[PDB]
Amino acid sequence: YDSRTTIFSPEGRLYQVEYALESISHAGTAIGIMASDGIVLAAERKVTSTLLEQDTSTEKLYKLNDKIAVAVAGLTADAEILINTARIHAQNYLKTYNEDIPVEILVRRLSDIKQGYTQHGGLRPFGVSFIYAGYDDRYGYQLYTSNPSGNYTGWKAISVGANTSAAQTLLQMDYKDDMKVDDAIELALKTLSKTTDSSALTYDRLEFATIRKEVYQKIFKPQEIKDILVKTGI
Amino acid sequence: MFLTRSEYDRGVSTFSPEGRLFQVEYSLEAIKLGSTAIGIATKEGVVLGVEKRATSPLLESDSIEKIVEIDRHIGCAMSGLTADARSMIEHARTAAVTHNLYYDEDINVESLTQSVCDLALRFGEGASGEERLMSRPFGVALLIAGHDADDGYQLFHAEPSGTFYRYNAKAIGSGSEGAQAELLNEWHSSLTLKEAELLVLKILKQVMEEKLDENNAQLSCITKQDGFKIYDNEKTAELIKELKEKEAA
Amino acid sequence: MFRNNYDGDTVTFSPTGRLFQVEYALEAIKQGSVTVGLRSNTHAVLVALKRNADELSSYQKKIIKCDEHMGLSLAGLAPDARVLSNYLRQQCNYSSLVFNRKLAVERAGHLLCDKAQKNTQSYGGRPYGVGLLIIGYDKSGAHLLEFQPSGNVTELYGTAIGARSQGAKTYLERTLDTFIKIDGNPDELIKAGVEAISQSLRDESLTVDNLSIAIVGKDTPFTIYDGEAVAKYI
Amino acid sequence: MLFKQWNDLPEPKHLLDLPEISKNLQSLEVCPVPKVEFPQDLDVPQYSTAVITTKIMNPLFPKNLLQLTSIGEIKTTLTVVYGFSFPIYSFGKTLLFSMEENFISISPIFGNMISRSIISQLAQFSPDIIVIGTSDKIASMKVMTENECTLQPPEFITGFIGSVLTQLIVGPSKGLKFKCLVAPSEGPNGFEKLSLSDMGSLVDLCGQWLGFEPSRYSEECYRLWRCDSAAIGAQSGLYI
Amino acid sequence: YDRALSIFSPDGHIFQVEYALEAVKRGTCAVGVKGKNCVVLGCERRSTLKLQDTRITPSKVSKIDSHVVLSFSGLNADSRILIEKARVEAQSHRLTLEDPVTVEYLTRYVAGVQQRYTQSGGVRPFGVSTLIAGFDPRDDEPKLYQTEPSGIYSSWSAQTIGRNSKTVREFLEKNYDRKEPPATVEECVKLTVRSLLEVVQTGAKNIEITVVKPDSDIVALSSEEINQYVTQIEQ
Amino acid sequence: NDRHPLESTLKNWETTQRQRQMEQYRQIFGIAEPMKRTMEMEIVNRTDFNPLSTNGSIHRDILLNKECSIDWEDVYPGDDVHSKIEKQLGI
Amino acid sequence: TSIGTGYDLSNSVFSPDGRNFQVEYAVKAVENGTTSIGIKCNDGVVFAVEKLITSKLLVPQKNVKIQVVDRHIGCVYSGLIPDGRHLVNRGREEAASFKKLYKTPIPIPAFADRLGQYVQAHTLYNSVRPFGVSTIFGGVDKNGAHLYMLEPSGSYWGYKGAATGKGRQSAKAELEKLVDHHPEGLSAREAVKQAAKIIYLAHEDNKEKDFELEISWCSLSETNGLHKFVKGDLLQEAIDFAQKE
Amino acid sequence: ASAAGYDRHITIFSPEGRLYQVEYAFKATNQTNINSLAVRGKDCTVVISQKKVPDKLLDPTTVSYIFCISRTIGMVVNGPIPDARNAALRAKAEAAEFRYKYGYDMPCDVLAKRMANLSQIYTQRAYMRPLGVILTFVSVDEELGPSIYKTDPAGYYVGYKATATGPKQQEITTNLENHFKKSKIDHINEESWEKVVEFAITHMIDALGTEFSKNDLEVGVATKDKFFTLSAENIEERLVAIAEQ
Amino acid sequence: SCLVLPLVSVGNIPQLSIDWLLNSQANEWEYLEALDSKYLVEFVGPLDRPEDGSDSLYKDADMKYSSALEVFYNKKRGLFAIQQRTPLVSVNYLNNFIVEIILPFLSKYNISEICIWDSLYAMEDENGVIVRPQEVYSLGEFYFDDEAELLSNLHLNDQESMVNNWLHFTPTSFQDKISVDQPIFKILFQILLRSIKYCSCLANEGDNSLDSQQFLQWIISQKVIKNAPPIVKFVRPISWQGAYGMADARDKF
C-alpha cells in the first residue's frame, strides 16, 4: 500500500509519508537551540569535497525575511521551492498588513503546503524538514520544526536528520533555559562534534547561523566559523 | 481448466460474463446493512417507520433523522450510508422548491422520484447527457411517500440503480427480506391507516434486533389535511402499547 | 481462463481478435424480458412483457413513446435504457423544432447508433447494455429498426429481443410470409404479434397487468395499450 | 477518459484474494488445521437422504411450505481465534446442511474440512445424497451423478460443493450414490447471483426431486426469491 | 477492494474509508460531554518532552467562532486545514447572512467538506473525526456533534474518539444518565476528568479542558488539578 | 461601456487564437489533425498539476511553438494549495 | 511469437521486437469479417461483398453492406460493425466538409490520407483502442479511378486489387491471377463479372450458409463518375457468368 | 533485456538507467525492413530508399516513403508508414506555421530541431508513445548549402554529410566512409543532380549488393529551386545511364 | 525415477506446461491416483483428453471426474507428474502441503529427485533475485550427497539472511539466488530422495499458451529429465478450446 499516497493501509497509516520521514534521516544533521537572548542554528553539510566552494555554497541554511531563518534537511531541490514560497508569502504579508510576518503564521502556511502535497495523488510529499527560527512581538524567540507530514511543533532545542536521537539526548541532558547565545553556540558545536561521523568536524563540514539582540540575523562565513570552532576548542 | 482470480468485481465500468454490472450490485448489498425501513400505502393514507439504530445510549435518538420531509405533502425514509443520502435529500428538496417556485404548484411525486433517480443515475452518463458526477453509485436506497391529487397516496421505492417502482408495501435495510415476505403475507387493499401503522409496528417488532420501544422506533404518515407529520414519542409509545394490547395475547 | 486476462476494460483486444467487454454488453440483453416487434405495410406493432420486482410492486414501462409517429421498446439495463430513451426524445424534439421536420426513423436509428458506438472506443466509459426496438411510421412507410448496443442497427420485418426471445423469433421466421400481408387490419396484426411473444414464456401467462402493446400507422398515431385495454388482444 | 492510470497494472491473477489464516505469513512451521465438531445425538439412521447446499440457495426451502426445524449446530474452531458454526436443518426424512459460504470471513479450508467431516459422518449410513449448489464457470444448469457427467471439458465446479463432490468421488468413503445439480452463477462465493431463467428452471426441477407439488412449491419459491433475497440482488430493478 | 475509494467491498463496505476511520484511532483521546447548560471538552495531550515549548501551540481544541468549539483526534495536519476551512465558512456565513453559523450548520459543512474529499479517488480523505460543539446563536440549548471521514455525523450527549476510545465510551455509557445529566459546570468537569483518567495514566498535566457556555463564552481551565485531586479523594 | 475597449478582445486572445488556428487546420488537414493536437494539449494540461509554480509547463510552450517567444502576458504574470486541489479536480 | 504476453494488454506499447501488439490483435479481428473485394478498372472501380443473409427477417432492399461515403466514393468494410460504421460516418463528414470548403469533390488521395490519419491517431494514445476494421474505398475524380485499402494500423496503399475478410486467402490469390492475366486494364463491365466470379470462389469456405452479393461500381465512362449500385439485368448477368464456376 | 516493471509500458527510467521504451521504439524503425541513403552534391541533395512492394497486387504508384514537406525541404522515413505520414504532416504544418510566423522560408535545421523536440516530449511524458520512426530531412539551405539532418525516436538531432538507415545501414555507411576517405572531401563534387543520383545508385548497389530495376527504388532530389521525387521513367533513365557506365 | 511438481504462479505457466507435456505424450502418460486435496481450493471437473482425439489420459473407464490435484505416471520413463488445478488456500498452509502430502508420496514410490517448476513475475525484484534479466529461464540443482555438509549445518543454525544460496544455479540463468518466494519455504521442508531440481521462468500475465510451449521446449532441451522430445507436435488438451468461451456467433463480427 505505497504505490499511491492517497490510500491508507489497513493499519490506518501512510507508508509513503513514513518513507519520507525515513529519507530525512539520511540527510546531514541540523540542530537548533533557543537561548534566553537569541537563537542559534547549526548544520553539518553532508556533501563535502576539497573542491567544493565553501565560501559561497550556503545551501544548508536559508534566509526567509529579516529576523527569520531556517535550517533544512533532505533534498535541496525540494527545499528551494518551499523557501521561495515562504519568502513570497512573508513579503506579501508585509505588503498587506505592513507588519513583519509572525513566524508562527509562516510556519502554519508552509506546514499546510507540505501537507497539501501529501494529499493530491499526483504530488509526492516534500522530502524535507525545516527548523524555523525568528523573532516576533507575540512570543519573542521560538524554534519551530516541521516534517513532511505537514505538522509542526515548538521547541527550546531540537535536532533533525542523521543520528537525531543522539543529538536529542545530548541536548536534553545538557540544555538549560537561561543560556545565552554565546554559550548556546558552544552547546550546539559540542553536540554536532559528538554526533558527526567525521573524526574532528573541521570548519569545512559545518554551516552555521544565528539570530540575537532591532534584531541582527547573521550567517557566518567559513573564516569566522573556524575562528569560533577554535574559540570553543573542539 | 484452472481457477483464476476474477477482476469484473472491481469498478463500475466492467460487465461480468452474462452481462451483469456488479459494482451497482454490491451497492445494493450495502443497503441491507442499513436500518430497517417499512412503508405501507392505503387509499386513505400512507405510513412508514424506521429503526433508529442507536449504536449507544449516549447518542441522541431524537436527532438521527432516518425519516425526513421533502415538501408539505411529500416526505421519504432512507437507509444505508447516510452520507450520500444527505446529498440525495438535499437535491430532492431543491428540486421540489424550485418546481413550486417556477410553476406555483405542488410537485407531483412521480416527477420528484424521477428527478431523484436521475441524480442517483450519475455514476454514469446522466439522463440528459450530463457527464459522470462520481466514481461510485450511491450506497443508499430510499422509499418516497406522498400525495398527489392525480395519483392519490402512493409510495415509490428508489434504488441507486436509477430505477424506481410504485409499491403497495415495501421494506429495506436489515432483515428486510423477511419483513417484505411477512408484508406480502399480511397486506390487503382494505387496510385502514390505524391498521396500517399497527401493522408497521408489528413488522418492526418481528424484524427488530431488540425490544421495540418508542425511543428507537418512529413513524411518519401522509394525510391530505395533515400532510407530512412525524409521530412524537408519546404517540409512538401509545401505538406500541396498543400493539401489545391488540395483537398480543 | 485466458478471457479473464483481456476482458478487464473496453479498450484491450484479445489475441483471438475479439473484444470481450462489448460482448458482455451484448450478452446483457439476455437478462431482460422478451419484447417483440413486427412490420406491416400500413402498420407496425410492438409487443412487450413487463416484469415487476414482486407482487407488491407495479409493473415497469417497457414501451416509451417519442412522438405521435414513432416510439421504442427496450430490454436490458435500466440506467442505459433511460439514458438512451431520453437522448432520443431530446433529439427528436430538436429535429422537430430546428427543422420543423419529423425525425426520420432511419435518421434517428443512425443518430443513436453513433452515440452508442463512441462509448466503446474510450476507456472508462462502458458499452451500453440496452437492446431496443425503434418503431415508427413516416413519409417512407412503416419501419422497425432493431438496435444493439454495439452500434449495429438494421431494419427488420419483425424480431424479438431479451430473455428467451429466440422462440418468438422462430415463430416470426415461420410466419413472415403471413403477418406481413396482414396490412390493413391492426387487430389481426396485434394478435399475430401477441401470438409471437406467447412462445417466449415458460412460467407466466400473459395478463392485462404485465402485457403491453403499442401500435403506429398512417391512420393511427403512436398509441400504447395497457391494463384492461389489452384484454381483447390476449 | 483521456488516459488510463498508468499505475493500474493490474495485479496478477494466479493467486486468489482469500483471507490469510494468520498475520504471520512468514511462519516457518506446521500450520494448525481446523477442528470440526459434529452433533452425535443426530441419529442419522432415522433419515433416508441428505441435502447439502450453500447458503445462497435457502429460498428453495420455504418454511411456510415444509416444516423446517433446526436439529443442531456443526461447530468449528482454529487456534493460531477463528471459529464458526451453522445449523443442521431437517424436514421429512431428509437432512439439510447450509454452510453460510463466505470468502471474506471464511477461509475455504473451513469449508473443505466441514465437507470432509459431513461426508465421513454420512458414510456408514448410506443415505441418498442430493447436493445442490452453484458455479461461476458453467454455461447453463447441469445435472450430475457419479456414473454420468454433464460437464464439458472447460467447465467445472468450485467452492464448498467442490469439496463435497471431491469427498464423494475420491478419498475416504468414496463411491456414495449421489445426485447433484449446479445452477450457473456469477460473482464470488457467498455473494453470488443467479439468472432469472436459470433460477426458474431450478425451481421447476428442484421440486421434482423433493417430491413437493410443482405449482405450489414454485409459487412459494418465487415468493422467497423475489422478496429481496440475496441471490436475486439487483437484477429486478437493474434490468427492466 | 481496499486499493481504492471508488469500489464497494462485496459485503457492502468501502474498505478504504474504513481504514481511514481506523487511522483516526491513531491520534490521542478526545472527549466531549453535554451538561444541562454547559459543554466540556477534554483532550489527552501527548506527554510533552521537556524540550517542547509549552507556551506556544499547546491546545488541540481550537475555536471556530465566539460561540463554537472544535476538537479532534487523528492526523493533526489534516485537522488544522479542516479547522481553517471551517473558520472560513463561519465568517463567510456571518458576511452573507446577519446571523452567525448554527452549530448544526457548521458541523454539516465540515461533514460535507470531509465527504467531498472522498467523492474522488484523487484525494486522500482526512484521517480525522472532529467533535464540533457549542451553543446556537442566542439560544441556550447546548449542541455537540461528531464528524467522521466518511462524512457521517451525529449528535451525542457524550462521545469519545481517538486512542483507547472504547474504554472511555464504555465508562460514559455506564455513568451518564440522560434522565439527569450533570447540570452544574463543576459536575460536568468532574465527569469528564473521571472519564479521561480511565485512559490517561499520567497526572493532570496531560488532560486539557475546555468549557463553552451559552451567549458566546469560551474558557480553558488550568485548575483541573483540583478536580483531579477530588476524583483521587473519591477513588 | 465602463471597460477599456481593448479589454474584452485581449483578455482571451491566446485561446481564441488557438481555436482559430485549429479551425484552419481542420479545414486543411481534416478532423484527425485537430483531434491529435487538442488531445496533446489536454493530456499535457490534465496530468501537470503543481500549485506552487504558476510558471506553467515547459511542454505547453513546446507544443504551442512559443518555446522561443515572449509576450507581455509572459513577462508580467482562496489561493491556498487546497483550494487549487479542489479547483483542479473539480471535486 | 504472435502473442507477446505482457506488452499487449495495453495500447500504445512497443514490444521488445518493435511491434505494438494491440494493432496486431486488431488485425486479427479483421479476419472474421465478411469477405470483400475491390477491383481497379481502366476507368473505374468495382466493389463486391459477400453479405451472408443471416435470417429471413432482414428487409432485403434497405439492409445494405456497401456504404456510400459520397456521390463519388464507394466504401466497404470488414470487421467490427460499430467501428466500420463510425469510420464511414467520419469519412462522409470529411467529404461534406471538403466539398463545402472548396465546392469540388474531394480527390481520393486526400480523403484516403485524412482517414489514414484519423485511424492512425487512435493507435497513438493509451485511452483509445485501434479501429478493428479493414476498409476498401475508391472512386473517380480529376485524376482518374483510385482504389485504396487502409488497415487497423492506419497503413494504407494504392491497390490494383484488394481483398479482406475470412475468405481473403483464396480471393486474394484469384485476384492476383486475374490481374496477371489482364494487365491491360479491365473495363467496368468485365470487372463486374470477374469480381462476381472471385467472390463466389471465396464462398467455398462457407458453403453451407446462404449468401447474396451486392455489386457497385463507379466509372468515368459508365456513370459520369457517380457511384451507383448494380441492379437488375447486369447483376443477373454477373450471376450467370460466375455461376459457371 | 526485457523491461522490468512500469517501464515495460511507459517512458520511465529503469534500474540500469536506460529507457527500455525508447530502445524498443528504435527497433520498430526496422519493422518495414526498408533501408535508405542520403548524400550531398555541389548544390543539391539526393535521397534514395528502397521501394520493395513486394506484393504483386499493390499499386506501385503509392509505395512512397519520400514525403514532400515544403518547396525546399523533402524527407524520407524509416518505419511504419502510419507514423511516417503523421510525422510528415506535422512537419508540413510546422513549416507552414513557421513561414507565416517569421516571414521567411523554413530552414531544414530548425524544422528537424522542432521535430526532434516534439519527439522529446514523448521521450519523457508518461502517457504518450514515441512515434517510432527515423526521419532524414534534406534540403538546399540558402546559407548552409546542401544539408542532411537525421532524427530518431529518442529525440536526437545530428547533421550528416551522408547517411544510411534501416537494417542494412552498416555496409552502406562503411562504403560511404570509404568513398569519402579515399576522396578526402565531404561531398561528391558533381555539378549536376543527375550525376549525384547516379553516384548514390552506384554505391547503394555496391552495398545492398543487388542489381534492381526501376520498380525497386524511389529517388528524391532537393535543389535550391524546389524538391521533387523522380518518376519511374526518370529512375529508368538513371539506371540505364548506370548500366552504360 | 523422478517427479515434476508445477507451482501456481504468474500466468500459471507451470500448470500450462504440464498440460502440454501430458497431452503431447498421451501414448505414455496415464492416471495413477488423486492426492489428498485437503489444503487446496477444492476442484471438480470432467475428464480431459488431447485435442487430437487420442485415448484419454484417464485410462480406466471407472473414472468420471477429475480431482483438484492428481499424480500422472509414465511407466516407460519412470516419471511422475502432478497437475495442480487450484492454488493453496493460503501461504500459511504451504508448509503443511509439503509436510503431509508431497513427502509421503515421494517416500511411498521411492522417488529419487523432484523437479519443481515455477514462474516468476518481473515485478518481484524483492531482494534482487532477478539478475541477468536478458535471460528468461533459469535452472537450479541441489544434491544431498554433495551438500551433506550444507544440510548438516542448515538444520542446526540460521543466518537470518533475506537471500539464500543453497541451490546452484547454472550460468546464463536469470537468477543466482532465492529470497522469499515459494521455494524458500518448501526447500527447507524437503530438507527438514537424492536431489532436487528447480526450473524458473520469467513471465507476464496474458495468453501464456505459447510462452508455456517455449518454456517446455527449453526444459526438454536442458537435460533436466530423461524425456523424449515432444517437438514433433505439441497437442493441447480439448479443454483449452473453452478458454475464450464457446462461440462468437453474434451479429457484430
Side-chain angles (χ1 to χ4, degrees), chain B residues 5 13 15 114 125 165-166, chain C residues 4 58 60 82 115 124:
Chain B
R5 193 171 60 75
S13 309
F15 292 127
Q114 182 82 232
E125 180 147 316
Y165 294 158
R166 173 163 161 158
Chain C
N4 186 65
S58 196
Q60 289 172 116
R82 184 66 182 162
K115 179 185 181 67

Side-chain angles (χ1 to χ4, degrees), chain C residues 13-35:
Chain C
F13 280 86
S14 64
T16 300
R18 295 168 70 155
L19 166 67
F20 299 124
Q21 186 50 226
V22 69
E23 271 166 19
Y24 295 165
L26 267 292
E27 199 52 24
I29 287 162
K30 290 292 195 291
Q31 308 305 335
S33 70
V34 59
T35 185

Side-chain angles (χ1 to χ4, degrees), chain G residues 217-237:
Chain G
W217 50 254
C218 192
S219 164
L220 191 76
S221 64
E222 299 301 330
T223 49
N224 320 292
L226 282 71
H227 177 275
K228 296 195 170 186
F229 284 75
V230 181
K231 293 167 288 186
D233 57 5
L234 178 54
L235 182 59
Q236 185 58 255
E237 192 261 350

Side-chain angles (χ1 to χ4, degrees), chain D residues 101 112 115 131 134 157-169 182, chain I residues 37 41-44 68:
Chain D
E101 174 175 45
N112 177 204
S115 168
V131 64
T134 65
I157 290 154
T158 59
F160 169 80
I161 60 165
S163 309
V164 181
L165 273 296
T166 300
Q167 300 314 135
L168 287 170
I169 62 170
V182 287
Chain I
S37 60
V41 173
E42 278 295 330
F43 183 83
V44 160

Side-chain angles (χ1 to χ4, degrees), chain H residues 39-41 161-162 171-190 195-196 199-200 202-203 206:
Chain H
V39 58
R40 302 186 303 155
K161 44 179 170 180
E171 287 73 12
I172 307 157
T173 188
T174 43
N175 290 130
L176 270 295
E177 288 176 356
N178 284 0
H179 165 273
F180 286 118
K181 184 184 302 299
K182 75 174 176 169
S183 306
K184 194 54 56 176
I185 193 155
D186 76 333
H187 63 288
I188 306 309
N189 193 20
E190 298 267 31
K195 298 296 196 287
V196 183
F199 161 87
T202 301
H203 262 271
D206 299 340

Side-chain angles (χ1 to χ4, degrees), chain G residues 180-196:
Chain G
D180 184 75
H181 274 294
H182 293 79
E184 302 89 335
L186 305 165
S187 70
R189 307 296 290 221
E190 180 60 30
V192 162
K193 304 168 68 160
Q194 295 290 350

Side-chain angles (χ1 to χ4, degrees), chain F residues 25-85:
Chain F
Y25 284 20
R26 197 289 319 279
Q27 283 186 15
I28 297 169
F29 303 122
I31 186 58
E33 182 59 26
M35 202 205 79
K36 289 185 285 183
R37 219 76 72 84
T38 300
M39 185 179 288
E40 294 293 328
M41 187 66 204
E42 293 179 353
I43 194 164
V44 167
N45 286 353
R46 286 282 203 82
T47 190
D48 268 1
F49 179 56
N50 191 79
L52 291 178
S53 301
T54 187
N55 305 6
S57 301
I58 182 172
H59 295 112
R60 183 178 182 271
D61 291 331
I62 301 299
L63 292 157
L64 268 54
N65 192 7
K66 67 184 289 184
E67 71 166 349
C68 67
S69 69
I70 286 176
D71 291 331
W72 293 127
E73 292 155 280
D74 203 318
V75 182
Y76 301 107
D79 204 22
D80 192 72
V81 60
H82 272 274
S83 179
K84 301 287 207 45
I85 297 169

